[PDB]
Design an enzyme around this catalytic site. Sequence first.
Site, PDB file in Angstrom:
ATOM      1  NE  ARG A 130      -1.937  -3.223   2.706  1.00 53.86           N
ATOM      2  CZ  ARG A 130      -2.223  -4.028   3.734  1.00 53.86           C
ATOM      3  NH1 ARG A 130      -2.861  -3.578   4.816  1.00 53.86           N
ATOM      4  NH2 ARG A 130      -1.863  -5.306   3.678  1.00 53.86           N
TER       5      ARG A 130
ATOM      6  CD  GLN B 219      -2.717   5.940  -5.654  1.00 55.01           C
ATOM      7  OE1 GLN B 219      -3.902   6.340  -5.613  1.00 55.01           O
ATOM      8  NE2 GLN B 219      -1.677   6.740  -5.967  1.00 55.01           N
TER       9      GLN B 219
ATOM     10  CG  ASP C 241      -4.304  -1.381  -3.855  1.00 55.27           C
ATOM     11  OD1 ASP C 241      -5.034  -2.357  -3.579  1.00 55.27           O
ATOM     12  OD2 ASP C 241      -3.902  -0.657  -2.921  1.00 55.27           O
TER      13      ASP C 241
ATOM     14  CB  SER D 102      -7.544   0.001  -3.859  1.00 54.52           C
ATOM     15  OG  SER D 102      -8.147   1.221  -4.161  1.00 54.52           O
TER      16      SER D 102
ATOM     17  CE1 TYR E 257      -3.791  -1.072  19.485  1.00 53.60           C
ATOM     18  CE2 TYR E 257      -3.242  -0.893  17.159  1.00 53.60           C
ATOM     19  CZ  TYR E 257      -3.569  -1.657  18.251  1.00 53.60           C
ATOM     20  OH  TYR E 257      -3.632  -3.020  18.085  1.00 53.60           O
TER      21      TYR E 257
END
Lengths: 370, 360
Positions: free
Chosen positions: A120, A125, A128, A131, A220
């Site tokens: 990623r 892209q 991908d 995605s 987180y």
Amino acid sequence: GRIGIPRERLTNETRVAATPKTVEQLLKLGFTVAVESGAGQLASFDDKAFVQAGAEIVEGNSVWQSEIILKVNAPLDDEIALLNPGTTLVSFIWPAQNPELMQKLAERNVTVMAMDSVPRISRAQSLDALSSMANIAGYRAIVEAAHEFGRFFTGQITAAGKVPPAKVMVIGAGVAGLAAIGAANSLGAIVRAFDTRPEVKEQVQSMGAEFLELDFGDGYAKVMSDAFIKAEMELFAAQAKEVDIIVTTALIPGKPAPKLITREMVDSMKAGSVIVDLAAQNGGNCEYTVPGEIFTTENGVKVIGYTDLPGRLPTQSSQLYGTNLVNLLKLLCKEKDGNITVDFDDVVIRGVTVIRAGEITWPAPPIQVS
Amino acid sequence: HGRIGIPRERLTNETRVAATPKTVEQLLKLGFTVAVESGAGQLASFDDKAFVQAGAEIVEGNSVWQSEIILKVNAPLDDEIALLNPGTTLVSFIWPAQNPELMQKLAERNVTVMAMDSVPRISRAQSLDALSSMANIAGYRAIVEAAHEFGRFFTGQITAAGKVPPAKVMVIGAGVAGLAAIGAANSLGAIVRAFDTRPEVKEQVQSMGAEFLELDSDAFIKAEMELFAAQAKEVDIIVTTALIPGKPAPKLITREMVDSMKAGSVIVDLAAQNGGNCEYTVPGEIFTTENGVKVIGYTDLPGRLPTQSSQLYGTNLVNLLKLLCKEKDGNITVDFDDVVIRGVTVIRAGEITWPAPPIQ
Ligand SMILES: NC(=O)c1ccc[n+]([C@@H]2O[C@H](COP(=O)([O-])OP(=O)(O)OC[C@H]3O[C@@H](n4cnc5c(N)ncnc54)[C@H](O)[C@@H]3O)[C@@H](O)[C@H]2O)c1
């Protein structure tokens, strides 16, 4: 350099790894292409549309006699025997969730590239596939919601009265969520979106949706805290009461999906509301979800939990996925001569190559560049 | 007296109801009370609970038939007509021209019947015009069905894996339903083209960002077919709506036009209930051609948007009752000097008053 495109044999799979348009692209790369008869049928590509593009049609398992196999799903048990040594297989693999599958492929002396393991990073892209497929799933979720919804999505004034727009809540503003927001906004709905990551607020707001804020030491730890999960569920319980459509997209591969919409929240919704649960493949974000089916509650809510949303846009999914595979091949075949060079100095080739010549090379190390 | 009964519909697969909780609120504002048969709104997503919250009473049996007024979607069946008491006013679809026997049986009950299909199409009657309400829903739903069946994006999009073009949609007939289909298709981002024989719609079509197509009796027919044949090769979706001049639906899209389209195209044929504008149409079904075109011939598109169809239809009925009940005292008064009421009143206290005298 022969690329074979088999028919997808996983039951109910409608997608194909190449379209007539991507085949012309594979030919410009110096490859030849054989497509198995019937492979594109469910995606609306018949044999002669492939022939027109420059591929050869082949029957039976002749397709597996190629230097490279492009597929959507991983070979089934009875297809693994058909891989010949030195073949390069490109498909979804999901190595972390399938050690049994990775063993079977390694004993075949093939190179394997998992489309789920594309790094990623920015330059990847165009390759991908996760995605590509999520963008399709998010659009399709809204098509599926419109089909099951018994009211207008779009506000309008009729001679028989003013009709309000549907109200849509989208949970998760990753790729699938943004696509749902975009489709719902295009239909004139009032769209609201929650995502734990605050960085996405301007994206959401530019696509016309309200970014939902919570009541309420690192990030987180906050999203994992009892307080945050309480504020988040209260947000959802309250939205549930006033929206018509909920699209949930909270999915991490290999882990059961968090139950963010409870039986009790769905019970409080207006009859005829629809929930599209895009995490249904990992158990679903909604407690009412029955993966593979639409479940209608007693209060008359339709909980859509199909797990093959890209397969219900099969032509589009095949074209974009196929384009992802073309773009991977451009990287593999820099001089356009039908020769794959699997070069581990390229971080994306390294990330995607999970088996190389019989040796499991997954997992790739963290990316760290000078 | 002043009680309106809302029966559950009995016709096979009918999902609509002639009132909603919202219209019930309005009916009480006109001075009526309201009894809804249990389950009447269920398939339209209106629970008994919501009707009771609106101020209706839930009743079980043919209790609903013991009302001065009955609102329905479809005409009553035989066993229903026998429960109508003299002096009752029934409001529903009737279609008197196709149903002379039904007209007679209703007359013998000594009731008044207002047929929602016989609303005169003048402008001040539009708030009562159930046919437009339903045509508008059908045009929207047609596009919803097309997008569901279509295997590509409607919406043009730039992605990391390529620039996807928008779907191209041709709408034949830009009346109420075609205009709704144009709108729905625009909402989804499609490139829309439309044809109508009436040039007066041109300006509405163009203002929605659609292309009004032009041509190039029988010279008219063939040039129209020739336009359709050329468009059929370029477009992905055709929505076809040309219907009821007073007649079976004209075949505008032939088997040869459909065979020409790219694989995975969709045709939604809204004129299916009169044999459809498309030669491949099978009424009540999707038929898939050998070349991969899905030809959608549902004849119940409004029943596939049941909540919306019940709400607009039910508002149509409230608007009829606002005409018939000017004092808001729960009291029907039928005034035949008003041409809208003259048209819609097909039976009046046991006398058949259809057809109404000619109007313009
Ligand atoms: N007074 C008002 O404001 C108002 C509003 C809506 C409707 N209406 C009336 O009700 C009537 C019917 O309603 P509608 O407008 O939906 O029409 P419709 O359902 O009867 O037919 C749909 C449309 O398709 C068209 N058509 C017929 N043959 C065709 C062909 N071969 N090719 C292409 N198109 C063809 C018609 O011109 C019409 O516009 C109209 O006559 C209209 O006057 C009136």
